[PDB]
Amino acid sequence: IVDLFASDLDAAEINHTHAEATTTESGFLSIDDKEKLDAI
Amino acid sequence: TSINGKTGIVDLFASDLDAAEINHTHAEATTTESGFLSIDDKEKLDAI
Amino acid sequence: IVDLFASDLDAAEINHTHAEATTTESGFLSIDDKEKLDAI
Amino acid sequence: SAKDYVDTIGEGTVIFKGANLMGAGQSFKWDASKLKFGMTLLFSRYDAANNTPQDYYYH
Amino acid sequence: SVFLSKAQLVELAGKGILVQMPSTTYGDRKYLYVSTTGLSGHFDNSNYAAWALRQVTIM
Ligand SMILES: [Fe+3]
Numbered sequence: 001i002v003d004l005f006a007s008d009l010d011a012a013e014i015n016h017t018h019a020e021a022t023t024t025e026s027g028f029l030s031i032d033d034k035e036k037l038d039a040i
Numbered sequence: 041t042s043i044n045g046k047t048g049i050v051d052l053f054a055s056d057l058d059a060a061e062i063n064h065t066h067a068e069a070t071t072t073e074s075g076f077l078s079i080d081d082k083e084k085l086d087a088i
Numbered sequence: 089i090v091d092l093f094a095s096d097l098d099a100a101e102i103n104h105t106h107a108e109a110t111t112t113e114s115g116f117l118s119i120d121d122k123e124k125l126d127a128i
Numbered sequence: 129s130a131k132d133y134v135d136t137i138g139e140g141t142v143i144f145k146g147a148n149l150m151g152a153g154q155s156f157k158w159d160a161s162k163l164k165f166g167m168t169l170l171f172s173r174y175d176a177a178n179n180t181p182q183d184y185y186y187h
Numbered sequence: 188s189v190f191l192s193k194a195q196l197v198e199l200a201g202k203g204i205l206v207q208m209p210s211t212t213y214g215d216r217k218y219l220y221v222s223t224t225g226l227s228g229h230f231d232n233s234n235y236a237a238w239a240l241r242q243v244t245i246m
Contacts, residue, residue, distance in 0.1 A: 001227050003044055003220075003231070005057055009059070011059035011060070011099040011101065011102065012099065012100035012101060012104060014055065023122060023126075028076070031072065036125065037081055045202065053097060054098060054099035057099070059094065059100070060100045076114035077109035077116070085121055088128065140194035168194050186199060187206070
C-alpha cells in the first residue's frame, strides 16, 4: 500500500508558504514592508 | 496494492496528494501574513 | 518500475519560484521594488 | 451458551452497508430489545454526480 | 478518544480512517489504515507533527 504524499515527492503542498523577499531573491511580502508601505 | 485508497486504473494529481499546481495562487499579503504583493500595493509603490 | 515527481504530477516543486508581481497580476516582490522601498 | 450469547452481542448485527444519503424521508429502525450496548456508524466520502462510494476518508 | 468496533472493523478492514483534531484551527487530520489484522501507515500525518498518538487499546 504505497500511500504516496507530496512531502516525499518534491511537490509543493496546498497549504504552503514562501520565504520573505530579500535584497537578492524574490518571495512573499514581509509584514514590516506592508506596514511601512501602508504608513507611507 | 493501493495509493491513498485508490485501486485499479487510477490517475493521481496534485490535489490528490494535497499538493499545489504549477499555476497556483497563494493568499495575498496582509498585515499579519506574508503573501503575494497586491495590485494596489504595487501601484502605490510605483506612483511613489 | 516507474518514478514520478511533482513535474510529472503536474504539480509545483517544493523549491519553486513565482512570477513577480506586476500592475495587473499579483506575485512575488521584485528586487528593485524591495530596494526602492528600503531606500524610501 | 452464555459465551455464544455474549459473542453474538459483540459481533453486532450490521443493518446497513453501502451508500445512503438519508435526507428527508429515509430512516433506519430498530427494536427496544435489540438495543443492548449501542450502535456503530461509519462514514466516508460520496460523489454528487457519480454517486460512487469513494473508498477513503472514513470516520 | 476515538473508538472503532468489530462491525466497523469488518466493514473497514483493508481501508483507512482519518480523525480531526479538536483545536483552535482546522487541520491536523491523522490518517491511518487500521484493519482487524493490524495497522498500515498512511504517513500523511507526519507533517502534522503537532499531534500524534499516545496509546492504542484493544478491547
Ligand atoms: Fe507556491
